[PDB]
Each structure stands twice: as C-alpha cells, then as structure tokens.
Design a protein around this ligand. Structure first.
Ligand code: NA
Ligand code: NA
Ligand code: NA
Ligand code: NA
Ligand code: NA
Ligand code: NA
Ligand code: NA
Ligand code: NA
Ligand code: NA
Lengths: 373, 373, 373
C-alpha cells in the first residue's frame, strides 16, 4: 500500500471510531437566549461535564460585557481530566486565548485566535484527549457580573482512545521581575554587564514532571522603560540535566524575529499581535510562538525559562501562558492571585519628567542640561 | 520505530505508489494561446477526462472576461466520479472558490483561495480521490461568451487507491428565506419572539446519506435590512436522530466570531473575506469555515442546517456551498436555476425613504416625527 | 484501533525515539554577546557540526549589519549531509529565506519567513533528515565584514532514523535570459510569435537524478521592460520522458494567480511578498509557491523549467531557489559567481527617454510624435 500522506490527502480518508458531540450555551427552550445565566462576582460553574473517552478539538467562547468593562484577565478557565480533583489547565481566559491584560485585538494563529468583533470571538483548536471524563469550569473573579457567557465545546466521543494519546496542560504565570542589585544594566548603559551561567534568576514559564512535549507560549510583557526589553535568552532544562541543553540568543530571536522589533506580524506559528506603539519599547507587547512542527520533548521533566533582560537585569511586568502535552493529567503550581496579576499603569510623560528631575539632580542641576550628558 | 510525525516531518519522507499528471488548457501547438476555445452561451464541455485511479490535489482556474462583465455565478463547474452519470460536485464556479454573487475580491484560506488580480486567480487544495475515472465539466449559463477559460487539474495517478479513501462532494444551494407570518421579529423589536425547538424552517445547506464527514461551508448572505442577520443557530442532525446532537448559539458564533461583527478577517480555517460596509448589516457578507481539524462525522446520514435569523424570522437572500467526503460518489439535489440564484439589488436610500414614509403613515403622519418613536 | 488523524490530533500523541538538541550562537561565557565572532571578507566557517542521526526541524538566523549595508545576496549558506564533501544545499542566504536581491521586507509562508524588524528575522521549518552527520557552513562573499551572525539550529537526535526519510536539497540559480534573435516579441506586439514545442530555451530552476519530490520555489524576477514578464509556461520533465508530462499556461497561473497581477498577497503555500510598484511590470517581483500538499514526485529524475516570456522571448534578470527531497544526499551544479548574481540597476526615466529617442528616429523624427504610433 502507498504511504502517501499530508493534511489534505488524509482529510479525504474515511475515519473510524469517532462520533461528534457538542456542549454549548444554546437556549434549551429553543428561544434566542443562547448564553448561560449571569455569573455573580466570585461565582464558579462547571460549564461542561463529559463522561468517558474522547478528544475535545474545538472550543469557541465569547463574553458580555466586552473589555474594558469586563476584563477577561479576571475570568478564570480551568479544565480537569480523568476525574482528578486538580485542574491540568488553569488560566485567566483572555490570556489563555491570546488576549493580554484587560485588552482586545484581532489576531489569528493556527491553534488560538481572537476574532471580530475586535478580539471578542475566542477560538481554540488544540486537541485535548481524556479517558475518564472531562470537566470545564469558569470562575468570575471580577467585581461585576458576567452578564452572558457563550460557548461551544466540540469533541469526538471514542469507544477506544488510541493508547499513546497525551493530556493537554496549560498554565498561566505572572511575575513583576526584580532588577539586579546594581540596577538595570541592559546594554551596559548604566553599568558593567555580568554573565548568567546558571539561569538561576530567569523567569520560569513552565515546570513539570512526566513524559511529553511543550507546544506553545503566549508572552505578555509590560515594559516600564523605553529600553529594549528582549535581550534575554530562552533556557531549557530537559530531564533534570545540570547544564541546559537548549540555550537561545534573545527574546525576539526566540520568537523568530530580530533587531529589537515592534511591528505587528502574523505567522500560523509565531507573531506579534499587540505592539508597544510608543518611544523605544515602553509599554505593552504580546508575542507568541507555537511549537507544532518542532515541540520540545522530554521523557522525565521540563523546565522552560527565559531571562528578563540580559542576565535578568530588568524590572518587567511579565505574564505567560505555557501549553504542553504529557502522558497523564498532572497538577499545576498555585495560580497568581487577582491582585498579583493586575495590569500595571502605563508609564507616562509625567513619570518620565520626574525621572528627568532626579537625573538632573544627579548631574548637579546645571540649568541647561539637555538629557544626553 | 519512532512514531514521530507532523506536516513538515512527513513531507521529508519518500512516498510510494504515486505519479504526477496534469491536464491543463496549455496551447497544444506550443504557442501562447494557453486557454480553451470560447464557450458560447449555454455551451457545456468536459475539460478533464481521467481514466483509472488517482487523487486530484490541486486545481487552478481563471476566466476572461473578468467580473462584472462575465459573472462567475453563471459558469457552472461539475465533477463526476467513478463513471457515474450524475455529478457529486455541482456549483456556480465563483461561489465554489469563495467568490460570491457577481463579485471579485482577494482572500486566502487553507483549501480555497481567490488571489490577484483582485480575486481572479482561483485555487483549490481539497484532495479528490477516484477509482474508476473522473470527469470535470464546465457549463456557460451566461448570456455572453466565456472568451477564454484557463485551468490546471493536478493529480496523482495511483496503481492502487488506498482502500479507506472517500469521495469529494460539494453542493451549491440558494434560498430567498421567508419571514415569519408575524414579521421579522428579530431581537423582539417588532413583536414577541417564539422558540424554535425543531429546526423545521431552518435553511438547509447539506443533506446526504452515506458514511463520511462534512469539511466546509462558504456562506453568502445578502441582508435587505440594517438589522443584524446572524442570531440564527447552526443545527445538525446526525444519522437520522430526532433531536439534533449539535446545536449552536449564533451565526457569527458558528463562524468563530462574536458580537455582530462586520470586519474583514482571515484564518486558514475561517474568515470574513467580504463585509457589508454600510449601515448596520445591510448588504452583502461572505463568511466561511472549514472543518479540517474538526470535521462533522456521520455513519449513515447528515443534515446541516442554520436558522435565518432567530426562529427563522428574517427574509435573507442566502446561498451556500457545502463541502464533504463520503464513502462513495453520490447524487445531489437539483441545482437552483440561473433565475433563482440571480444576485439581488442592494437596498438603497430611496427604498428606505419609502419605508420611512409607510412608517410615518403608521404613526399618524405627525409633521415632526423623527424616526425613533 | 481508530485511524483518526490530523495535525492538531496527532500533536496530542506522545512521541517516541526523539530528543531535542540545539546549536546556537549563544554566548558561551553566559554574557550577552550571543552572536558569532565577525567574518572577514571571503571567510568561511562551519557553524554547526552534528554527529549521527537526526532531523533538523527549525532554523532561525539574523545578521548585522542589516541590508543594504550588508547584502544577504553575498552571504552563502551551504549544508552537507552524511559526511559528503559536496553540499546538498547551496544558496545566497537572503534568497534561501525568501529575501531577494539586496532587499528586506516582511513576509510569512508556512516553511519560510522573513519577520520583523523589516525582514531581518529569518526562519525555516523544512525538516532535514540525516543519518551520518550534518554540517552547516557560512561564507562571507561581501567586501565588508559580517559584524555579527546569530542563529538557532534546532534538531531532533534519533537513535534510529525512520528508513524512508529523504534528504533536503536546495539550489540557487541565476540567469540574465536571452531574448529571441527577432527580439522581445511578447504578445506579438513587436513581431510575430512562434511556438515553443520543446522547452529547449526555457530557464532551468532544478535538475537532478534520484527518487524524490520537488517541494518549492522562490522566484526573483527583475524585468527591464514595462511589458508583462509572465506569459511563460512552467514545463516539467519527469524520469527522462521526451515530452514533458506537466505543462502550464503562464507564470502568474503557475503561482495560483491570474491576469498579470502586481499586488502583494499571502497564502501559506504561495504569494507575492514584493511587487514592482511601477509602470506596467517594470522592476522587481518576488513570487513563491510551495508544493507541500501537492509535490512533484519522480522515481529517476526531474527537470523543472519555465519560459522567460512566451517562447522565451524576453530578457529577464531571473534568479530562483528550488527546494526538494531525494533518497540520498546528492551534489549540485556549480553556483553562480558573485559577479553573475549581482542585482541589476533599476531601469529609470533617463533610460526610457533614450529608448523614446531611438524610437522617434526609427519613425523618421516627426516633430510631434506622441509615442503610440
Ligand atoms: Na441554540
Ligand atoms: Na437559539
Ligand atoms: Na541575549
Ligand atoms: Na502551455
Ligand atoms: Na504556451
Ligand atoms: Na441565537
Ligand atoms: Na545565550
Ligand atoms: Na546570553
Ligand atoms: Na503562456
């Protein structure tokens, strides 16, 4: 028999052992109230409770009111596989679908998109297998109601789950990174740079034990300086090795770009859906990269890290969502609290005028200091 | 042996049992008249007659004159598999390739595209297997000539067609949908809304008997009201079930979008290549969704439907092309006639001023009626 | 067992026999000098020397200084598989990654992209298997230094390479094509057109012996006339056949477009990332097409050709990069020299005024000749 194969060729092959199912917010009366009842502040709800074996292969969500009125940073999505009491997916729902902070913007990637109206149509094509059921939970951590929650959870019911199917995991993390004690010595501008041989102070976006592979990252940086935020290298520790086997060159480099960019760009596997649009790199940037053709495999453990500036010198407000598969459904670290992951104010002309004043004082307050002394 | 696989990894594997063939409109003399002879009005022609086993995996077409001079709504493409006297593909050629009405516009999706010059380069990457030959027919239903028809039909000749290969089907449908007897009660604005528990009056875009899976839809709506046209739910009846197992929440929702959008957007699997660009949602919108990673499977039958407004309250000029695979090549319903599928005029300021006059009369013709009473 | 499969479904399957490795320009001291030492003019260097079995599945590169200061047409990339003393990949690095001439511009295709800042982030997702090692070499053919060369070479080490894995090949070619002796008779404007039954004078972008399949072409045309450059048909000779089995209709047609286009357009498999932006088609156009779902297979040999204007009538500055797989790593033809592949000057208003003068003289220099006589 011919071994011919590719996406469109295989689509033409008849498939066995699959049956479509869908859980949705469809109005059960047949009317047009095709959304769930409102969520009060703090309310949790199981929106999908599936029994047995299957594979989720399409999720769509939308929410009313839209951002900024109702921040999608403050609505949590959690997924529990195989009857476990812990979630293997836990994230603010906006960041999970590639919508950072309390913002909205259209973009398309192969697994995740935020489509019209202006980023409110959320869709996900990651496949999520399960053997002993699946539970999807929504939690309203906002101070106002979720007036209307709309969704589709499309999946294939299977009489027999193929034996090598993994379990989908996703974890949101957030840190306000700490500058070096000597200050933000990026590019050696304010002081001498030093080597980072260990990755000890790197930001950690993923850490797990098991067998599997890393498949993606949504990276949300809010930079409080106009200085370039992305000199930092990615560094991966596979299967408990002492020296990281995968070491990068820069953050834009890791995201398949170069030369401190700040342009919107789209590829199915990587892109910049939201750029800072201000002096230097001051403000917010969202970057993503999916490792679909090129996952990062591990047989025992994986620790995915990235420097926050060269040798971790910068103070950055950084959040990430990491996506991966592993052989069984495992637990995640504690989630950042609502207060911990709150979006930060944009640094503005008043703040920078105060920096200029402290800088003028450090130079002896000469009446005609320009600013480049 | 390693089970490593993905699109780019598998592309690097040597393939057995395939041989390239191509039927094209190439000038047989070696000159530069690389198109077919003109088609007179009403003329049919078999443009490709393939014997034996194979898989079509790339089609490109262009036509002269371009639209609006020669409407691609009035040139029919038909495909016959395995020596059958009925077509398993039947559609106006523009709508088949994602060009609605008598229009032209650039767009790209994974299986279908209309590229430059301004939507005239038509391409298709759906795989189309056949065991006992294939015939592709073009029919000119325009009142003028097809001056020049250009094409490529690329396929792989196979000594043995792999046994689980399905057959590609596509069907164009059109309806001028009927409003409810009480009128167009969308959003409960003109009167009370009622439930749709059965889907009895839904628009039907696909209905077949066999084993296979649905893989796509091109949806062409011409809305004669500024009111939002897409509150309607998709509803699928799999294998003759009485209650539909897949029920949606809205039309934009089904197309992975939200909040009554009218923005151009592109994803390999879904998008809005043509938007209404007028008050509310008055005018023409083209939406598509391909179910490549997430097909709708069936073992005995499938009926794919969608409401035309909530509880089918709206009058919409709707046409669709549905794409699917099934185990054997089957027949399609009768095609809409040329008159039935004719594009409708755009509702304009004169028409709406006449509506305003009837509305003023219904309010007693107060000399200072504003319009929001 | 279910035969369910597709890209996202298969991504969820656990994989065996693969281990990630990466060679990069990471600063070995842990500092922030994450690029290689400068290359002097003429200097060659092996940047990656891998032993054993594996598959490269992601490459990223950037270079300092950027274009036009340092032309990426004058930095050569070469790849040697299985310990061979000849390269199976040989190309100027800009053209290899879809950046023609000495230019820079953002674009994205599925296998190759040039991302921000303004086309400097080069990435490649072609899979490149090898059984007895791999060597990647960079040669500086510029008259100035490569100040900083940055890269990632991501690959999977395999204990056993699956047996049907091919070898990746890529070859850059360049020709200043010769007009017909009677002149540039395109469209029969300057004289009678004649048939091309043999393809004898066609431009050759690929020629090899072995078993495999063609997967892509980057086509870089610099047209010195405003006349349309793309009437020329693609013509393929498979396995030494006398009459080419695959014959096209036009160059834009071959690139899934139509009607002499000159619009930027993007599809994962084809597109126009750089268009001429001048009268007619005068100037530079970059077109690409990847044959991922629809490769051109061969069991013994392949010769890929295209006319340079109908019946090869035009003088075009043409360069191409062809990409393919075959069963073993084979040698390539001699590369064009630096002088041979040098970008040509743009034809300008002064040049055309001189053409007008020769044309006026040919018409007898009537004092009021308009130009359309
Ligand atoms: Na519903
Ligand atoms: Na409903
Ligand atoms: Na760095
Ligand atoms: Na031809
Ligand atoms: Na020809
Ligand atoms: Na609805
Ligand atoms: Na490094
Ligand atoms: Na470093
Ligand atoms: Na031609």
């Amino acid at each position: 028999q011919s071994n011919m194969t590719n996406e469109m060729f295989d689509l033409a092959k008849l498939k066995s052992g699959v049956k479509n199912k869908r859980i949705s917010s469809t109005d059960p009366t047949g009317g047009n109230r095709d959304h769930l009842e409102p969520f009060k502040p703090g309310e949790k709800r199981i929106i999908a409770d599936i029994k047995g074996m299957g594979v989720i292969n399409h999720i769509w969500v939308t929410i009313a009111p839209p951002p900024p009125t109702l921040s999608r940073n403050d609505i949590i999505i959690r997924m529990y596989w195989d009857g476990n009491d812990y979630p293997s997916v836990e994230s603010p729902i906006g960041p999970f679908f590639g919508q950072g902070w309390d913002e909205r913007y259209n973009y398309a990637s192969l697994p995740l998109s935020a489509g019209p109206e202006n980023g409110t149509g959320l869709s996900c094509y990651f496949a999520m297998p399960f053997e002993k059921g699946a539970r999807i939970e929504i939690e309203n951590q906002s101070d106002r109601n979720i007036d209307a929650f709309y969704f589709y959870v499309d999946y294939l019911e299977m009489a027999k789950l193929p034996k090598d199917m993994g379990r989908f995991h996703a974890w949101y993390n957030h840190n306000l990174t700490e500058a070096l004690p000597e200050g933000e010595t990026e590019w050696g501008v304010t002081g001498a740079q030093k080597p980072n041989t260990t990755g000890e102070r790197n930001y950690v976006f993923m850490e797990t034990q098991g067998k599997g592979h890393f498949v993606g990252i949504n990276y949300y940086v809010h930079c409080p300086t106009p200085m370039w935020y992305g000199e930092g290298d990615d560094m991966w520790f596979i299967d408990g090795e002492k020296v990281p086997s995968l070491i990068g060159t820069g953050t834009e480099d890791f995201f398949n770009t170069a030369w401190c960019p700040k342009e919107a760009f789209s590829h199915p596997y990587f892109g910049y859906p939201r750029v800072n649009n201000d002096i230097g790199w001051l403000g917010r940037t969202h970057v993503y990269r999916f490792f679909i053709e090129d996952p990062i495999f591990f047989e025992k453990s994986l620790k995915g890290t990235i420097e926050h500036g060269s040798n971790n010198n910068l103070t950055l407000d950084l959040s990430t969502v990491a996506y991966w598969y592993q052989d069984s459904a495992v637990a995640l670290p504690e989630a950042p609290t609502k207060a911990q992951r709150a979006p930060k104010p944009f640094i503005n002309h008043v703040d920078i005028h105060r920096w200029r004043d402290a800088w003028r004082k450090s130079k002896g307050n000469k009446a005609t200091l320009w600013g480049n002394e």
